[PDB]
Structures are given as structure tokens and as C-alpha cells.
Amino acid sequence: MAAAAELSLLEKSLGLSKGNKYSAQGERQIPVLQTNNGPSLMGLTTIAAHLVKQANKEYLLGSTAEEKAMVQQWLEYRVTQVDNDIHTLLMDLNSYLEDKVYLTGYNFTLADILLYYGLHRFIVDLTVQEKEKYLNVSRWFCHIQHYPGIRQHLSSVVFIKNRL
């Protein structure tokens, strides 16, 4: 039931008090939200973008047409690529992140939150040497894990920072 719990997490990180109920749909257990407006909404990234707008935090979806397309890109990556396989994923992500603090390039967006929640599973299990192998992933993940209100109940992963 992981996706419903993850959308519950995001509700809390977005500072939304009214916890929604989610069902599942299909052999792949895709999340479903009935809304009060009220069209019914299905899929992690579709619901998450809905939740952002009602938290009055639409900047998390990006601020220019280019940043929006980048947020869209990284949302699609979460549901298609994240959701031994992971070591190949992590290496490519490590290279991508070498020159960036945030996933979409410049600013903190929903794409960082959802990728952080999606990888958390795998990052908790990396050895010390593996965290040192993927330095850029570790650096980004540590920054999001400390970012105000995001981690909530997730375990902190231990990252030791040089000369600190």
C-alpha cells in the first residue's frame, strides 16, 4: 500500500491538515483520490500535482515553461524508472547531479520531494562505501532530507561530511 502512504507523507510535508483517503486500482496498486470539486484522480504524480495546487504552492511545479517541463520529466522518471537495477540507476543519477543542487537544475521543486521519497527505500540500505561511490546522490539526498518539513517520519540516513 506504499503509494497511499507516500501521498499521506506529501500532504504533511505540504502543510495540509485534512488527510485524504486513497484506494488502489489495478494489478499494480495505483493510487486513487476522490476530490470534493469533484473529478476523481488517479496516479501518484497526477495526485501529487493536485495536492501542490491546493497547498497554494504551485511554484513547486516550476516557474518557467522550461522548469515545468523539467519538473514533468523528473515526475515521469519517478514513476517509470524508480517505481542491482538501482545501482545502474544511481550511477547515472550521480553523474546528472554533479553540477546541480536541485533535480531540475536551479530551484527546489516537487520533483526533488518525490524522488527523495522514492529512493529513500534504497538509500537507507547503501553501505558506507556505496554512499561514498555516489557522492552527488548522497549530497543531494542529505540536503533534501534536511529540507524544512520534508522528511517527517522517514529515517535519517547517516552521511558524514568532510572536516565536520
Swiss-Prot record:
Residues the record lists as N6-acetyllysine modifications: K133
Disulfide pairings: none
Region named C-terminal: 64-147
Domain of life: Eukaryota
Record region (Linker): 57-63
UniProt record, GO biological process: cellular response to leukemia inhibitory factor; negative regulation of cell population proliferation; positive regulation of apoptotic process; positive regulation of apoptotic signaling pathway; positive regulation of cellular senescence; positive regulation of DNA damage response, signal transduction by p53 class mediator; translation
Keyword presence, Endoplasmic reticulum: no
Coiled-coil ranges from the UniProt annotation: 148-164
Tissues expressed in: Down-regulated in various cancer tissues.
Residue numbers of N-acetylalanine PTMs: A2
Residue numbers spanned by region N-terminal: 2-56
Keyword set, alphabetical order: Acetylation, Coiled coil, Cytoplasm, Nucleus, Protein biosynthesis
Subunit structure of this chain's protein: Part of a multisubunit complex that groups tRNA ligases for Arg (RARS1), Asp (DARS1), Gln (QARS1), Ile (IARS1), Leu (LARS1), Lys (KARS1), Met (MARS1) the bifunctional ligase for Glu and Pro (EPRS1) and the auxiliary subunits AIMP1/p43, AIMP2/p38 and EEF1E1/p18. Can interact simultaneously with MARS1 and EPRS1. Forms a linear complex that contains MARS1, EEF1E1, EPRS1 and AIMP2 that is at the core of the multisubunit complex. Interacts with ATM and ATR.
PANTHER family: EUKARYOTIC TRANSLATION ELONGATION FACTOR 1 EPSILON-1
Protein name: Eukaryotic translation elongation factor 1 epsilon-1
